[PDB]
Design a protein around this ligand. Structure first.
Ligand code: SF4
Ligand code: SF4
Lengths: 595, 70, 263, 188
RNA sequence: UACCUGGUUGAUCCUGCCAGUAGCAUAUGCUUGUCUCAAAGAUUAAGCCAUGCAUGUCUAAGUACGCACGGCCGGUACAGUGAAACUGCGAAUGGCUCAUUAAAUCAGUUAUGGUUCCUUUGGUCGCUACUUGGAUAACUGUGGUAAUUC
RNA sequence: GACGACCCAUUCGAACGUCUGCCCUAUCAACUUUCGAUGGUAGUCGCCGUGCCUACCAUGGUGACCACGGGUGACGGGGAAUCAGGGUUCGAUUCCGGAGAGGGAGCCUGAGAAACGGCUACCACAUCCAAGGAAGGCAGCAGGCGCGCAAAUUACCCACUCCCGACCCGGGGAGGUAGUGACGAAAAAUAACAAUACAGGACUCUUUCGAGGCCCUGUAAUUGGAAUGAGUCCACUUUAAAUCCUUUAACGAGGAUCCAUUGGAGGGCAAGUCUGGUCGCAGCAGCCGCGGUAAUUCCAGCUCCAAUAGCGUAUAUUAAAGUUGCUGCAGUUAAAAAGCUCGUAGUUGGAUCUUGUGGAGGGUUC
């Protein structure tokens, strides 16, 4: 049933004294295949991850305990709660919700996260894998007998408890529901709760603006605000952390963690850097192969569960063999070309307005060799400062018009095409230079059916960001314009989205301007940096470009937030609001370390 | 070769054509031949017989009730 | 391990003469520490629930006792597992009835109703005689009662009568040949007869020979003999069957002939 | 764990030592066919209760005449054989227990009595009348064909009062046939 | 139910073992309609253990200035319901397993005139005084650590 | 009345001691002994007796009637399976006694502990960290990994049975309830009855032939009416609340379905010297044996046998085994009497030391 492999991961292994008896006792070696390799005076043995079978015979016969079995994940046919379609995806197991504490789900993208929340909320129903005459609340509520889910599901059927859920994609909200300025919030389930959230989510915008006027970083806060003022016994927060600022992620966690106390259930899921371990009380992890199946672990405590995902990669259930601490630019390498040829695009400053909001730019240099990162809070208008380029607004009353060609990717998309995405590839040339710009991105992992020729009306929104990036990289330009490139990407493919642009541009000899919240993207891409300051939606200024040590320390100083990084796994971590590390850093003026 | 000791055995395969089900490098369940450690009939030096292959019984394979899962 | 005293009793380990059923439960009432030994008493809960049937459960026994209705030896007892035993009187003044604990001839406590003027005294066997400070003489009974200034003729193994309102001695019976006794242990438990010989051994146990009303003879260790009357006449009223212990063939024949049990 | 359950039970028959003895096979089949039984286990039950009766009488015959135990258990065993009508009141001593046969016990079954008393036309019809709730012993509906009839219970076998024979409602076949027969005229 | 049968030879009579026959209790294969009982991680590893629960407690009768809730108005010690905290009692019983252990454990039989004993039950309780001393917890108020029933 | 305390006696015990009782082993014959072994005198320590320990002194103590040493897939007992009589084998496991909470050691509190749901340290594992520090023990109930031929739900409740506390009131994964469950035991369906045609046999009329005939079998072209629970589902009852069982309205059977299986058919051992295929091959066969072109034994069809909601196979063990023999075997030639004689322990050991008349119960004297 489970696949099994022997592992030699023991310190001080001793080919010099053991008489090599693990090699001699193997049946696959007796039948004449090279499953074990060892010889005297070699340091440590080698063992095949694919010729091996799970018998465990060699483990009884090593003179030292140097050898043991691990299981590997497989398509077990056990414990199937739901199947997505005929011959399609299997969800397997389901977690158990508990009152008065926060449960965090974690794992790679597409592995089965949102379908568990839809089942627990009663918006979906389980079907046990039956496609013909599927169960209806009689075999369900009998298949669960002897478990906590039996006494749970009967209460959501009888209206003894009720559920509410934050949307995955918040850009649907201005189309899916409507009201005037202010009124859309005013007529929800309670009055007193609306007055108290004003201290901790920013309600200055919705009393001046229509819902279809809003930015993604307003829509996320509006989605969080409108779920907190409704009445429910169970609440579910799918990604309360996309399109959201480094200071604002902490503010959002605090207003979720206040809901807990009066015997209410809460479930959360994130792809975060440094806040799930402030928000959660327990963790569950999902594993499998995302186009095909997923499975759910037993629950862990916070620090323990984070280490089982991010520093090490095997649970107490004797299984997983995957993640290998992919949380940083772990190699810390640099080896690229230094060149004295250059071209210049230097420009004058301006003053500008998008609304009842003052904006300004100072005069400065721009040149062909470099990538520019832009730093500053949400509501500082900086998406419009990208939109000046390619000439869409105030082209020559300050600034300068581009000499030939510029290419652009927006942070807001709403698709309008038909039949397939395949025909949209006519906008670029693919065969002339296949990697990194396609084969290590669009087709990764596993060359999957989910993307090759689907309609964008059935495609996942996290894959729509990938194909929209891959298309807009295809046309020639001196300058590339990017904002929210990390939206809906997991930690594996965030580093690939950084690699696919920097490994291309640095060998193409070409420029970009890029906008991100996420610290990992910013610190890897930059070579010079731009920083904003002022009052959001009132009065803000864009500064002259700077070197990284001058720029980011002033940005972190303005946030009043400071960072730590660990030598055993390179994970970046936030220091709490007052501490010995916080005062020792802010008296020194250094806000990041070992750089 | 037995799992719990790593020592070596030879075993008989009952019925007409059953050797075609067995393959190589996979698990069998083995049992005694009916005489408490002594050999049986015309077969020289064989003390054991096969009863289960890859978690399916030879009787259920031979009478067509089940098949090897692949 | 056993690091101190025990406080439970399994139902198959409980005394046979309580007649507890096999299938209602794992546990039995552990008798409260008190005047009578654990093997030799009847817990008050078994008398009210199982014998008299005034209560269907242990909670219906608890709310009879907490109303202060039950007296033992003239004192109100609120404890439901109190260890009542041989010669004690129970009074229930609210229903207007009185009982004394005496053995049935098959070796178990009978229910035995008594008249209210007979409910005023009890009979006690002497356990010990000793002298305290200032030369004051003391007596000890089979039920832990201590008496000062007993009559100097009262010796070991004798029976004394006490009034329950004051606890002082009224009259006594000497242990000697020809007096009536009841047997309170061993296989002869619940039989009655006259003492006819005592045989003695220096070290180990003395043996008494006893004679029945029908002329049968039986014996037991001296620790099992309780004297109940001077000569032929008892000082207490006696239950149905009067201690005669008829054999299984005589018992069959009366059960067929008398047609009792609704024949 | 301790529990308030009990675990007392026993087997009520024994298997024969020679499986294929020709002289044994047809003797057992002749008892099945004459008394209308289901299987061999139903004969092996009756041989086992007779063997236990004879094992006790052979012990009591070793003791002296007028031994107290020989008097008590011997009078009990003899009363209990007369109560079921297996032994004659005019005989009544341990020496005649050793003369009993299996056919003395097979005759006292309710299935045999329903046939011999004339409530049924065969030993095979009698079992079907008992097992279909049609028959009554004193006040009680009884449903078990191996029930053994006591000698005072003997004169109180009858039909059930809620039965299509015995004075009750007609069965589900006669009710449907009458209903659809009247419906043959239309509107039924 | 105090029981035997096939197999050494050209054939016979023996010795002697192999094989058959019936029960019992562990695994395993094929098969299954009704109804009453009910064993179940001992055997190998007394190997390793995520998460939740498995031990607490107040009467008329030890200490009530919690505005916490409250009355017909008042403290005549002081009403009345009463969170918290101090004090008292229990936590040494119950449940789990079978590693060690061969005159040891254990069983029947006897002894403390060689000891200790919460509680229950009965004895015993007469060689500034019309009431003494200071000092803490709950509570109020100000803090330290990445972190704990600090 | 409530609460409290020194001392007697009780109750619940605990601790130490007496007598008799044990599986295999000599390829274990001598062992213990100021490194206390056996005993004496005085003391220390302890709840108390005592080499329990200290000083001085003596030279003892156990063994062929098996000591001392080694083994045990050894916790002891009540008990369990099989059994003519006598026996052999088993007992981790609900009652009773003992021991232990990863391995060893030390100790606080208390009437009671050398406690692990208490503490301190070393040894083996191992969790979090801001690298300064902090925290730990499922051989309790559910649940997981590893192991292996091999073992169930992270459900409901203090209603019952009993226990704890200051208490008529709070608490209990002790305990009760439901789920899984062909370990195992008791009961018990899967067709009953008529009519018709042919069939068997009695009996009567008749020399025989033939007819009348009354009681039982089948089975086909196929006939006929009556009975019933397996299922579905309303209500009462059940219980802490429910399920199940029992009770009761409405639907529910013609057989081609509401379709019984597991092993066999040469002998031991119930049942084919049928028909087709293979050809010392494939295979069968506990044992003796089947197959080389006319197979009672392989592979299949039909027919028949045995047990039946059950039947087959592997492995330990009891009977059969008078093949471990006490009851109860054998030793000239089948396996087996020391080459011969002496002899201590062990087992076995010759004859002998006070009777008939009378009476009761019973006989015609005992
Ligand atoms: S695994 Fe063990 S036996 Fe093999 S080479 Fe290493 S030490 Fe030697
Ligand atoms: S587990 Fe078995 S197959 Fe794998 S390496 Fe060891 S001996 Fe070889």
């Amino acid at each position: 049933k489970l696949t099994r492999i022997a592992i030699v991961n023991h310190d001080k292994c001793k080919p010099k004294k053991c008489r090599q008896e693990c090699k001699k006792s193997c049946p696959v070696v007796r039948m004449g295949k090279l499953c074990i390799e060892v010889t005297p005076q070699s340091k440590i043995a080698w063992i095949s991850e694919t010729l091996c079978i799970g018998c465990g015979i060699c483990i009884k016969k090593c003179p030292f305990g140097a050898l043991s079995i691990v299981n590997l994940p497989s398509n077990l046919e056990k414990e199937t709660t739901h199947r997505y379609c005929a011959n399609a995806f299997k969800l397997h197991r389901l977690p158990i919700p508990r009152p008065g504490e926060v449960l965090g789900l974690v794992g790679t993208n597409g592995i089965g996260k949102s379908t568990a929340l839809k089942i627990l909320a009663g918006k979906q129903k389980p079907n046990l894998g039956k496609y013909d005459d599927p169960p209806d609340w009689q075999e369900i509520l009998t298949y669960f007998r002897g478990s906590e889910l039996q006494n749970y599901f009967t209460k959501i059927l009888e209206d003894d408890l009720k559920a509410i859920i934050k949307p995955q994609y918040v850009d649907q909200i201005p189309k899916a529901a409507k009201g005037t300025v202010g009124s859309i919030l005013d007529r929800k389930d309670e009055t007193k709760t609306q007055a108290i959230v004003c201290q901790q989510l920013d309600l200055t915008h919705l009393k001046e603006r229509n819902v279809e006027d809003l930015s993604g970083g307003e829509l996320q806060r509006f989605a969080c605000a409108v779920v907190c003022i409704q009445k429910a016994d169970i609440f579910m927060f799918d990604e309360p952390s996309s399109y959201l600022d480094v200071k604002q992620r902490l503010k959002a966690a605090i207003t979720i963690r206040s809901l807990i106390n009066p015997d209410r259930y809460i479930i959360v899921v994130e792809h975060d850097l440094s806040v799930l371990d402030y928000l959660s009380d327990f963790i569950c992890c999902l594993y499998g192969v995302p186009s095909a199946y997923g499975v759910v672990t037993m629950p862990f405590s916070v620090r323990e569960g984070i280490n089982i995902f991010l520093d090490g990669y095997v649970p107490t259930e004797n299984l997983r063999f995957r993640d290998a601490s992919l949380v940083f630019k772990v190699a810390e390498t640099a080896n690229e070309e230094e060149v004295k040829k250059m071209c210049m695009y230097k420009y004058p400053g301006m003053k500008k307005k998008m609304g009842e909001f003052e904006l300004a730019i100072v005069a400065g240099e721009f040149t062909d060799s470099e990538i520019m990162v832009m730093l500053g809070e949400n509501g500082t208008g900086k998406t419009t400062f990208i939109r000046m380029l390619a000439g869409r607004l105030k082209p020559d009353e300050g600034g300068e018009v581009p000499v030939l060609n510029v290419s652009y990717k927006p942070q807001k998309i709403s698709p309008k095409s038909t039949g397939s995405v395949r025909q949209l590839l006519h906008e670029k040339i693919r065969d002339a230079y296949t990697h990194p710009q396609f084969v290590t991105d669009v087709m990764k992992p596993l060359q999957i059916e989910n993307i090759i020729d689907q309609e964008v009306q059935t495609l996942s929104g996290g894959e729509l960001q990938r194909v929209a990036l891959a298309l807009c990289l295809g046309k020639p330009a001196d300058v590339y314009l990017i904002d929210e490139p990390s939206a809906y990407l997991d930690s594996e493919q965030r580093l690939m989205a950084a690699r696919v642009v920097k490994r291309f541009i640095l060998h193409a000899k070409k420029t970009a301007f890029v906008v991100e919240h996420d610290f990992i993207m910013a610190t890897y891409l930059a070579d010079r940096v731009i920083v904003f300051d002022g009052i959001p939606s009132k009065n803000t200024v864009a500064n002259s470009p700077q070197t990284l040590l001058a720029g980011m320390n002033k940005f972190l100083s303005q946030l009043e937030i400071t960072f730590r990084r660990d030598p055993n796994n390179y994970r970046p971590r936030i220091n709490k609001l007052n501490s010995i590390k916080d005062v020792e850093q802010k008296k020194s003026g250094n806000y990041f370390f070992l750089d | 070769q037995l799992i719990k000791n790593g020592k070596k055995i030879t075993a008989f395969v009952p019925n007409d054509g059953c050797l075609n089900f067995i393959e190589e490098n996979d698990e069998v369940l083995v049992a005694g031949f009916g005489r408490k450690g002594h050999a049986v009939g015309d077969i020289p030096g064989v003390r054991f017989k096969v009863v289960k292959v890859a978690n399916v019984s030879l009787l259920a394979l031979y009478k067509g009730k089940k098949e090897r899962p692949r | 391990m056993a690091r101190g005293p025990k406080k439970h009793l399994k139902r198959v380990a409980a005394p046979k003469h309580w007649m507890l059923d096999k299938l209602t439960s794992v546990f039995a009432p552990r008798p409260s520490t008190g005047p009578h030994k654990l093997r030799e008493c009847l817990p008050l809960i078994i008398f009210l629930r199982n014998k008299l049937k005034y209560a269907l459960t242990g909670d219906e026994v608890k709310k009879i006792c907490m109303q202060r209705f039950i007296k033992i030896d003239g004192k109100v007892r609120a404890d439901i597992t109190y260890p009542a035993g041989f010669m004690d009187v129970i009074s229930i003044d609210k229903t207007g009835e009185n009982f004394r604990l005496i053995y049935d001839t098959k070796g178990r406590f009978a229910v035995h109703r008594i008249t209210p003027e007979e409910a005023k005294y009890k009979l006690c066997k002497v356990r010990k005689i000793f002298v305290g400070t200032k030369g004051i003489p003391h007596l000890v009974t089979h039920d832990a009662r201590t008496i000062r200034y007993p009559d100097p003729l009262i010796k070991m193994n004798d029976t004394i009568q006490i009034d329950l309102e004051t606890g002082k001695i009224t009259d006594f019976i000497k242990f000697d040949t020809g007096n009536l006794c009841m047997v309170t242990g061993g296989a002869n438990l619940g039989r009655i007869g006259v003492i006819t010989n005592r045989e003695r051994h220096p070290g180990s146990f003395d043996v008494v020979h006893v004679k029945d009303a029908n002329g049968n003879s039986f014996a037991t260790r001296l620790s099992n003999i309780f004297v109940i009357g001077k000569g032929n006449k008892p000082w207490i009223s006696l239950p149905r069957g009067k201690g005669i212990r008829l054999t299984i063939a005589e018992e069959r024949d009366k059960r067929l002939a008398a047609k009792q049990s609704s024949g | 764990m301790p529990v308030a359950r009990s675990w007392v039970c026993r087997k009520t028959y024994v298997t024969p030592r020679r499986p294929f003895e020709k002289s044994r096979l047809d003797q057992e089949l002749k008892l099945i066919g004459e008394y209308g039984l289901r299987n061999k286990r139903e004969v092996w039950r009756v041989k086992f209760t007779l063997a236990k009766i004879r094992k006790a009488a052979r012990e009591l015959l070793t003791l002296d005449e007028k031994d107290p135990r020989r008097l008590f258990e011997g009078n009990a065993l003899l009363r209990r054989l007369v109560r079921i009508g297996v032994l004659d009141e005019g005989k009544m001593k341990l020496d005649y227990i050793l003369g009993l046969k299996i056919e003395d016990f097979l005759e006292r079954r309710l299935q045999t009595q329903v046939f011999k008393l004339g409530l049924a036309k065969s030993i095979h019809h009698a079992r079907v009348l008992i097992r279909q709730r049609h028959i009554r012993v004193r006040k009680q509906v009884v449903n078990i064909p191996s029930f053994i009839v006591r000698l005072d219970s003997q004169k109180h076998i009858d039909f059930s009062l809620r039965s299509p024979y015995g004075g009750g409602r007609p069965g589900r076949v006669k009710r449907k046939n009458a209903k659809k027969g009247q419906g043959g005229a239309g509107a039924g």
